[PDB]
């Protein structure tokens, strides 16, 4: 129920943050790094597969961002729909009125 | 019309998705600016910090407000009915019509 | 529908059904036609017909209120309306009209056979609840 | 750009829906016999009266 | 405009012709008659819900194996007769016909018992049968010379009754066109009781 | 004589108002106020009933219930005529004190009723109880009074209590009751159902031999219980608590 939606939005937000940081680092060091020291770990062994992995990153970040935003919007609409649907919430004068009506009909009939 | 509480609830929700749209738009401008920043002109460098900060602060408080709404759902629990009176009101209006029929000076 | 089911039992007194949308009531001096019609000079009795429609609607509302009261009163009672008892729509109006006709006829008879024959007779009219 | 254009379009329809609907009334969701999707329905008969 | 199964019909007719020694025409005629009978039954079902004869006036039973419809009318009628109608395929003409199974209709002259074009004017045929049965009963009553003939109305029977010692007046009795119970114009409680006894 | 098929439960007054609304959302009917007064009578211990067949146990002594309706003019104090007579008055009935005291009930002194312990076995989903009932219409004589009548039969007074609550009529003859019970003594009045309402949903069957009807009744009761899942838990009470024979003393309240 609502707690499950809370948790789902939680991984939604953390996934946004993580993929944001990932695309940031990927595009910033998209310029390949060559360092003589053994400490650095950046490998570009096969030339064109580097571009393939780059477009990999592009497609992944696009799909994930769009899907997460769309899911959040659908979640908001579902909440609003639940809001709309689920929230469960003289005689005497008539006497002379009918008397005049019936006498008028009797006279007119 | 609906009771007011639902009205400000829907206003807050509408603000929520408008904020989400603003976040997407600002993501578009930050992606745009990073391209020319990689190109090599440093004039728009100061704008980058402002755009990033506004993007993050737009991402955070929107989710916070939505969290507040979902929390409101938690304590809002416990807080044809019209048919039970429907015939009655129909009754009333019919007699009103008879009154208009009964008085010939009001049929103008 | 209620008018149809009610008037199906009044054939013996001069009430007939023409088609699925028309019913006819005959009186020694008058005729009434009730029709259900699709949309596809002020006369004397137009107000009369409007009043008839109004009281028919009022009687239907009264029937609904009686049904609801009977339902609320007790759960066991099966709510199956009786045509002879529950459905009272044309009965009051027809009774009023025919009672007025018979009252006029008896007034005439008394005047001819008593008032015209025996002078000085005093007549007083009363209604008893 | 595509997402912004489309998305603002459905906010346009969304606001039209929100400010076009009035209210007590028995409202629910039903599955259409022909379409099979969920649509809003209102009970207006005298069945409960 | 009927949604015919064209390919299944193609294979069926091809198989029949391959196995044929005539048979295709017989099958087509049988299917046409069955479809006409089924749509007549469907029209009866549609009419019975809201028709003038809904209140036990007409009952119809349909048999597909014999492809015949039996119609019973005037259940509350015991005047040495039972209103029965049979709709079925005529042997001589291979056509669906309606027969009013009644001995009174059997010896009745200048009055057709078998009718066609049931689909177009089933209501007219039923009304004609109703009026003919009422007229036959009325003619039998006149032959017994219990009720005198009404010149103004051919469907109204006059019964002579003395209202007082010297008065000798006629009373108008009429026949219901739907269920067929005799009724008076302005029956008294005794008159209503004896009308019910007559029924 | 009926076979009554019943299910029980209880609720705290805090949710009371909310509960009421939900019921009207389901049944489509509004609640109706009611009250009653029950007096329990037991066989006189001064008389030795040797006729109880000890070697065969043909029968055991039991307790008789006499019920009557009391007008609200005895239950409304001087502070309450301003409010209309509807269900909301129950919201003010939370104190152990009540306008009807011991002296008025003594001045009063109907429906006579006897029951048996529910049917044994653990394959029963609803409480099935047998009830034998009759009605007293009037009386006369030199000592025409309920007390004198029950002493003539051979019974004496044991205690009494007062029920106030609301009723809901649903389809298929199902009756749902929300009750508050006040025990009454010369020492004073004490509300046993303190800070809550007792909920009881039941149906009546006229003939115990008909089993199709009993199966239908059980189906309706279990469907009703499965409708209220998550809000209130309706349960079968203890079979040994609804036993009203004189030999052993306990009272489901």
Nominal resolution (angstroms): 3.3
Q: Please state, as a whole number, how many other Cβ atoms lie within 10 Å of the Cβ of residue F252.
A: 12
Report the C-alpha dihedral over residues F154, F158, F163, F169, rounded to 10 degrees: -40
Gap between the Cα atoms of F197 and F15, Å rounded: 10
Q: After which residues is chain E broken (C to N over 2.5 A)?
A: 21
Selected residue of B73, B92, B96, B106 to mutate for chain A interface (largest A Cβ count, 10 A):
B73
CB within 8 Å: D28 and A85: yes
Residues F162, F37 contacting (CB under 8 angstroms): yes
Which residues of D fall within a CB distance of 8 Å from B2?
23
Which residues of D fall within a CB distance of 8 Å from B14?
15, 18
Gap between the Cα atoms of C81 and C72, Å rounded: 15
Structure tokens of F217? 């009744």
Report the C-alpha dihedral over residues D19, D25, D30, D34, rounded to 10 degrees: -80
Residues C27, C97 contacting (CB under 8 angstroms): yes
Gap between the Cα atoms of B80 and B74, Å rounded: 26
Gap between the Cα atoms of F74 and F250, Å rounded: 30
φ, ψ dihedrals at E7, nearest 5°: -70, -40
Gap between the Cα atoms of F3 and D17, Å rounded: 55
Strand, helix or coil for residue F103: helix
Gap between the Cα atoms of B59 and B81, Å rounded: 43
Residue F218 burial (C-beta neighbours within 10 Å; 0-12, 13-18, 19+): middle
* Neighbours, chain D (3 or more CB pairs < 8 A): A, B, C
Gap between the Cα atoms of F5 and F206, Å rounded: 11
C11: nearest CB among E50, E55, E183: E183
Selected residue of C49, C57, C58, C68 to mutate for chain B interface (largest B Cβ count, 10 A):
C57
Q: Please state, as a whole number, how many other Cβ atoms lie within 10 Å of the Cβ of residue A48.
A: 7
Which residues of B fall within a CB distance of 8 Å from F30?
84
Residues E111, E102 contacting (CB under 8 angstroms): no
Residues F3, F204 contacting (CB under 8 angstroms): yes
HEC assignment per residue over chain A: CHHHHHHHHHHHHHHHHHHHHHHHHHHHCCCCCCCCCCCCCCCCCCHHHHHHHHHHHHHHHHHHHHHHHHHHHHHHHHHHHHHHHHCCCCCHHHHHHHHHHHHHHHHHC
HEC assignment per residue over E82-104: CEEEEEEECCCCCCEEEEEECHH
Interchain CB contact of C8 with E (< 8 Å): yes
Method: cryo-EM
CB within 8 Å: B2 and D11: no
What separation in angstroms does the CA of F207 have from each of E91, E113, F202, F213? 58, 56, 16, 9
Spatial neighbors of E125 by CB under 8 A, at least 6 apart, are: E98, E115, E118
Gap between the Cα atoms of A11 and A74, Å rounded: 16
CB within 8 Å: C68 and D49: yes
Residues F245, F61 contacting (CB under 8 angstroms): yes
Gap between the Cα atoms of E112 and E131, Å rounded: 13
Please tell me the number of Cα atoms within 13 Å of B56 on its side-chain side.
9
Q: Which residues of A touch D (CB under 8 A)?
A: 66, 69, 73, 84-85, 89
Spatial neighbors of F169 by CB under 8 A, at least 6 apart, are: C71, C72, C74, C75, F27, F29, F32, F175
Q: In angstroms, what is the C-alpha Rg of chain F?
A: 20
Q: In angstroms, what is the C-alpha Rg of chain B?
A: 28
Gap between the Cα atoms of F70 and F104, Å rounded: 11
Gap between the Cα atoms of F70 and D43, Å rounded: 41
Taking alpha carbons only, the member of F208, F49, F23, F235 closest to residue F116 is F208
Residues D7, B24 contacting (CB under 8 angstroms): yes
Q: Please state, as a whole number, how many other Cβ atoms lie within 10 Å of the Cβ of residue F126.
A: 22
Structure tokens of E89? 């395929």
Among chain B residues, CA nearest to D42: B80
CB within 8 Å: A109 and C97: yes
Structure tokens of D30? 């039903």
CB within 8 Å: C45 and A105: no
């Amino acid at each position: 129920m609502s707690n499950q939606a809370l948790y789902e939005k939680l991984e939604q937000t953390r996934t946004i943050l993580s993929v944001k940081l990932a695309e940031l680092i990927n595009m910033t060091t998209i310029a390949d790094r060559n360092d003589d020291d053994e400490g650095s770990f950046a490998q570009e062994n096969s030339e064109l597969a580097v571009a393939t992995t780059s477009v990999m990153m592009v497609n992944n970040q696009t799909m994930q961002l769009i899907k997460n935003v769309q899911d959040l919007l659908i979640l908001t609409r579902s909440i609003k729909e639940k809001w709309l649907l689920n929230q469960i919430p003289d005689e005497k004068q008539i006497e002379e009125l009918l008397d005049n009506c019936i006498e008028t009909f009797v006279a007119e009939k | 019309m609906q009771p007011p509480y639902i009205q400000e609830r829907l206003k807050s929700l509408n603000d929520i998705e408008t904020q989400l749209c603003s976040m997407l738009q600002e993501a578009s401008q930050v992606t745009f600016i990073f391209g020319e920043l990689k190109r090599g002109n440093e004039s728009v460098k100061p704008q980058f910090e402002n755009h990033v900060k506004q993007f993050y602060e737009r991402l955070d408080k929107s989710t916070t407000q939505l969290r507040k709404e979902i929390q409101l759902l938690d304590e809002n629990v416990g807080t044809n009915k019209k048919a039970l009176g429907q015939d009655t009101e129909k009754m009333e209006e019919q007699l009103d019509l008879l009154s208009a029929i009964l008085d010939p000076s009001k049929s103008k | 529908y209620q008018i149809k089911k009610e008037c199906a039992l009044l054939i013996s007194y001069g009430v007939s059904i023409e088609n699925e949308n028309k019913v006819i009531i005959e009186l020694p001096n008058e005729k009434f036609e009730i029709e259900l019609l699709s949309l596809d000079l002020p006369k004397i009795n137009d107000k009369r017909a409007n009043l008839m429609l109004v009281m028919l609607r009022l009687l239907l509302v009264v029937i609904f209120k009686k049904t609801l009261r009977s339902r609320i009163s007790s759960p066991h009672g099966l709510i199956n309306l009786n045509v002879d008892d529950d459905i009272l729509i044309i009965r009051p109006i027809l009774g009023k009209v025919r009672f007025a006709n018979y009252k006029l006829l008896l007034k005439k008879i008394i005047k001819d056979y008593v008032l015209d024959i025996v002078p000085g007779s005093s007549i007083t009219e009363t209604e008893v609840e | 750009n595509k997402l912004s254009s489309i998305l603002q379009n459905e906010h346009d329809y969304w606001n039209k829906i929100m400010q076009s609907i009035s209210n007590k009334d028995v409202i629910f969701k039903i599955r259409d016999r022909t379409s099979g999707q969920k649509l809003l329905a209102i009970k207006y008969g005298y069945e409960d009266s | 405009n009927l949604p015919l199964n064209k390919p299944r019909l193609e294979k069926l007719i091809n198989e029949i012709l391959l196995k044929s020694n005539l048979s295709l025409y017989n099958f087509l005629h049988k299917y046409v008659l069955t479809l006409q009978l089924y749509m007549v039954h469907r029209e009866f079902l549609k009419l019975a819900n809201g028709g003038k004869f809904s209140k036990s006036n007409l009952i119809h039973n349909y048999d597909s194996k014999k492809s015949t419809i039996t119609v019973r009318y005037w259940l509350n009628g015991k005047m040495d007769s039972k209103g029965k109608i049979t709709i079925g395929i005529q042997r001589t003409t291979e056509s669906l016909i309606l027969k009013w199974d009644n001995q009174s209709a059997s010896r009745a002259k200048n009055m057709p018992v078998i009718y066609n074009n049931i689909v177009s004017n089933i209501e007219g045929i039923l009304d004609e049968i109703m009026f003919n049965h009422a007229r036959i009963i009325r003619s039998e009553l006149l032959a017994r010379d219990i009720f005198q003939e009404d010149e103004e109305n051919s469907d109204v029977l006059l019964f002579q009754l003395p209202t007082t010692c010297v008065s000798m007046a006629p009373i108008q009795l009429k026949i219901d066109l739907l269920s067929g119970q005799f009724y008076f114009r302005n029956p008294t409680p005794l008159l209503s009781n004896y009308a019910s006894k007559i029924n | 004589m009926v076979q009554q098929l019943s299910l029980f439960g209880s609720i705290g007054d805090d949710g009371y108002d909310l509960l009421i609304s939900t019921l009207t959302t389901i049944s489509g009917n509004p609640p109706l106020l009611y009250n009653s007064l029950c007096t329990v009578w037991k066989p006189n211990p001064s008389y030795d009933v040797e006729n109880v067949n000890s070697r065969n146990q043909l029968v055991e002594p039991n307790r008789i219930k006499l019920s009557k309706e009391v007008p609200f003019s005895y239950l409304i104090d001087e502070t309450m005529m301003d409010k209309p007579l509807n269900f909301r008055i129950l919201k003010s009935f939370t104190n152990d004190k009540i306008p009807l005291n011991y002296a008025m009930t003594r001045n009063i002194l109907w429906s006579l009723q006897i029951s048996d312990i529910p049917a044994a076995g653990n394959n029963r989903s609803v409480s099935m109880q047998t009830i034998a009932e009759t009605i007293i219409l009037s009386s006369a004589g030199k000592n025409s009074s309920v007390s004198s009548l029950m002493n003539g039969l051979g019974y004496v007074f044991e205690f009494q209590y007062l029920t106030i609550g609301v009723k809901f009529f649903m389809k298929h003859g199902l009756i749902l009751e929300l009750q508050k019970i006040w025990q009454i003594e010369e020492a004073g009045n004490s509300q046993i159902t303190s800070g809550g309402f007792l909920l009881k949903a039941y149906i009546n069957v006229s003939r115990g031999t008909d089993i199709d009807r009993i199966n239908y009744t059980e189906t309706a009761l279990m469907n009703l219980k499965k409708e209220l899942q998550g809000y209130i838990e309706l349960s079968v009470p203890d079979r040994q608590s609804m036993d009203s024979r004189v030999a052993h003393g306990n009272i489901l309240i």
